[PDB]
Symmetry: D2
Subunit: 351 residues, 4 copies
């Protein structure tokens, strides 16, 4: 019974292994996997075997940005059936705790989440999942778009928490994959202009393709100088800044750059301690907000994709079959591409 699976055993130890075919409980579905995007999260576990307090204490299956086809459903599942194409939302609450009740299930301490240990991910042939967290895709939304909902959702959640809306000018720090999905989400939510900063001329070219209104190549500027160049291009201070690099200097830039009364959202992972002009922000009522994944983004993402109101397709720079997963991870690490997409279906390998 063939179920090739990509597994991290520890720092730098990545292996392709055969796994049993999972058996779906009464409210789960079994999925034949199709398209699985990888991101810095996966690469980080690969390299270091941990992300902060999340530690790989036993071999873990990677992969958490995914779509596939229902092949089997549990006795209690009614909204999905074999043949259904679905996007997988990787975080599924185990308990109806208070976070779940108030509608912030992302914060639930007992949540299951693909490829954050000890929870196995979906970079494999066959995978089972809580049925309520698999979302039927319409026929004009590709498997890859379905997989891309996950990174898009990072941007949606951050932009919601920032309060991005009609006419706002927005600064996005970083033209990596995180920055690009926040650019996409901001424009989708009505931002008039997004400026994107980055050190790389290459990444910024790609941010342009994706829809950045302005690009700004940073070199040795101070945070105040960055904020200043940003304001100069926009004609004003941006109501919202989304910081996607985790780099302290970029966080400071965001604080100086953001319009008074505005919001800076931290999406990139920084060091355990950050040094910031906390006062500068606080005295200007610039709020500083973080994000932890996302909640309630799949249906609205699917709605925007299905209506062609957002375009995530240019994000995919590489495709590899599942058998070439180790190479794909090398490609993702070298960071020349954006989204490296893994194709798990021997039957079909198109988008």
């Amino acid at each position: 019974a063939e179920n090739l699976s990509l597994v991290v055993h520890g720092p730098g130890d990545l292996r392709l292994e055969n796994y049993p075919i999972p058996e779906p409980g009464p409210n789960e579905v079994l999925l034949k996997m199709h398209s699985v995007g990888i991101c810095g999260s996966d690469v980080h576990y690969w390299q270091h075997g941990r992300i902060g307090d999340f530690v790989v204490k036993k071999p873990m299956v990677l992969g958490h940005e995914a779509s596939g086809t229902v092949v089997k459903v549990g006795s209690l599942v009614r909204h999905l059936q074999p043949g259904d194409r679905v996007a997988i939302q990787p975080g599924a609450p185990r308990q109806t705790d208070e976070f779940c009740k108030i509608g912030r299930y992302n914060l639930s301490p007992t949540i299951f989440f693909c490829a954050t240990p000890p929870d196995d991910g979906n970079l494999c042939r066959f995978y089972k999942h809580n049925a309520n967290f698999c979302y039927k895709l319409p026929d004009n939304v590709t498997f890859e778009e379905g997989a891309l909902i996950e990174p898009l959702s990072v941007g949606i959640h951050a932009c919601r928490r920032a309060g991005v809306t009609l006419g706002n000018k927005v600064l996005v720090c970083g033209a990596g994959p995180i920055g690009l999905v926040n650019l996409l989400a901001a424009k989708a939510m009505g931002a008039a202009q997004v400026v994107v900063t980055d050190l790389s001329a290459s990444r910024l070219s790609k941010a342009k393709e994706v829809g950045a209104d302005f690009i700004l190549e940073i070199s040795n500027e101070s945070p105040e100088e960055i904020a200043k160049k940003v304001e100069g291009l926009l004609g004003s201070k941006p109501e919202v800044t989304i910081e996607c690099t985790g780099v302290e200097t970029s966080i400071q830039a965001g604080i100086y750059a953001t319009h008074s009364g505005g919001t800076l959202v931290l999406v990139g992972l920084g060091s355990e301690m950050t040094s910031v002009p906390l006062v500068h922000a606080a005295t200007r009522e610039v709020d500083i907000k973080g994000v932890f994944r996302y909640c309630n983004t799949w249906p609205m993402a699917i709605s925007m994709l299905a209506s062609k109101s957002v375009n995530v397709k240019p994000l995919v720079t590489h495709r590899f079959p599942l058998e070439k997963a180790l190479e794909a991870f090398e490609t993702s690490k070298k960071g020349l591409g954006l989204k490296v997409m893994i194709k798990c279906d021997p039957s079909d390998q198109n988008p």
Copy 2:
């Protein structure tokens, strides 16, 4: 000193008259008028000499959707100067009352407002206005777009109060000018799909041009049937309904149509008493909200226009010089067009 002015003396009594050149106080500007759109508000005062409790007790200058050029500024005015092209926000608070302080100046009982009596409007050659409520237009935004900010703002304010955002499906009742600006605002704010209903095949054709995702021609349907047809086209109940007709049956339709937990916003003017399945809405937590003009929409409208993120141009169906204002009002009443635009500048009559 030539300052032709369109004046309503009472029910059906419209005249073009010469007025003195207004003198701007210390915080006012004098404007050479350029483009002035007319709407049902103006036509209503023309026909009936009142809109509810607002009564024309002495001759009134009409016109409240306008743009022009600063020719003179007061001693305290610093952000505008002669030569500046500006959009005029017709509601300017006279006092720093509590509504103003909390940021809801539209509700200020002593607000000045063009062409709502006893306040004279701007359908004339020369007009003076509170400087803080004239907004500089950038050079890639036409005078007509500047004039159109006013009707667009009706839609922006309504859609904000409805909470329209990323991915929502929205029902707009009415394909008249009010309905079309709400269609535009909803899409600009991130709605995935807007369906527009109306009795007229002609108006709906125009709603399509403007960007309606679906159109629905109504005839003798009951409110439940309308709600049903709407749901059928969208694939779900719309999170937001914007009611733009003021027609009781359309209001009821909105109540049946709107998703539970959603919002129905009333923009059209109905009868003094309305009969509604108030309970049906209330038990489904469908909120019912109204609007009174707008507040804080000019800068964000200008930002969206300047970035080409919204297109109001297709709204203009007719242009008349100021001298043909009576004809223009006839055209606006017969309701075959959408926006009838009046050109007040003898120097320039382009958009």
Copy 3:
């Protein structure tokens, strides 16, 4: 095996019957019932065998405002154990649907809810319930206070949706049980003054005891006159009105009474069609909101009770043992009391 249960068989057909001892599933608990309040909801099913579209098609156990003691827990239950005193939140979602995910589980169409048919209630000796919807009571919170969380929650949810906060003046229409819990919730949320209207001098005396800052006895006033008398007592128009009678004239009064920009919340059940100065509200941006039960109120209610920050005790006017349930229902119908409280525990019959 003794499990006396109060059952409605149809219009005016109420019986006390022995039921099997329910068996808790893996995530349920079995409760030895202690205190069960009754309300117009129960009385309504008794009298008419329906509330609108909710119809008693087979015998139903009544009772939905309750507390008791855990005697048995399911294999998956960890936060509760035998001996735990708990308040029962009667609405427990069956499915993780979209309403649940976004934190509005009250709107879930498949929710289980005590004594709304076809779901049996908890007016009995032994009752089983979803464990996540039973809330441990601290030792300084009585069983009756625990039972009273349910009616209090009606007020909490309504006042939240109204946006009651520090310093607001609030109008509550109706001094029945619904009105009194909204008075309590408004004061708890920081309202400076609550005025309560009613036809009964008796009910208003009780509203005073409970904490009403002003009482207003209505007789033949018109809605405009009511609004006027209200404003006169408060010194201003109330930012919030909570309408608790369902009476059309009282709804109209609320519309005239509420401050511009304010909110009217409809808690009382009215007729299928209501006639209202919808326009008057809409043009003053008075929002009209309804409620459907409550969501996420139990923990904050328990917190306020435990800190003695709210006092629901004066609401209980009568106590009857379970065996005298038919009499208790007669008492509740005659409407001279407020909260009629039923004592189900043969071991203990104190508050």
Copy 4:
């Protein structure tokens, strides 16, 4: 013409000087000052002649927490008249800028603000002020309560921005005057429990008198230990933390202490750079918000005082006549009291 005035000429240079009687413009009033509280702001200008970028470049009158009696009004003033007792809101916008329009006038860069240079304050006999920012006091609200609205408003604004509401448990860092007003505001807004931390047994005794549910004396605890002790007393992590010391370790404590999804509001002034577990907060969606004074707090503060729903009286520990202002400032600096209150009226020196 006697108008004694307290003036800072520079670091440690405080003088009492006679000033001209100010002349109120058309929308100003002249006030006979009555009660003026002092705070760290005043003391800071006294000691250092600056607070960050706000620098005393010429002699400045101090005092910004004040009340008095209207003696003269401008030609345009209608809501106030000689004899009116009023509370003075020290920040009065000069321009109708965008911050003002959207209801955040506190952020207006051109705002006038008592005793923040170059704007003279109200520690004097006679003072003139923008009429719209003087608020009539009812007869059951004392002059001192009127003066205390200003510090209370600091707490109101911070607690609003934190989202303090019914049932929340709140941590307040610091039992100085800033901490105590935030304790008062939180309880007024419906917090079930407030715990207050501080190094001083004396300050905490006073926080108890004022209404703190718990007090915690800190010594050499680490931020994690503080957060831990806080959680232990409350029985849970507080939904809101208000940090009132500006001390980096206390800010870190707030981050560890605050419930996930919660809010930490920074009210105390810290160093230009702060080192914080920014990541810890961000990954738990603990928002970090600052405050800059307040907006729209006077009317709701007056409403709460007039209804006896909040008690600021215990804050006043000392009273000095204006002639003993230098001593009063010494008393305020030695920090043994809380609110030092200055009495400016030779006619009356009661509360």
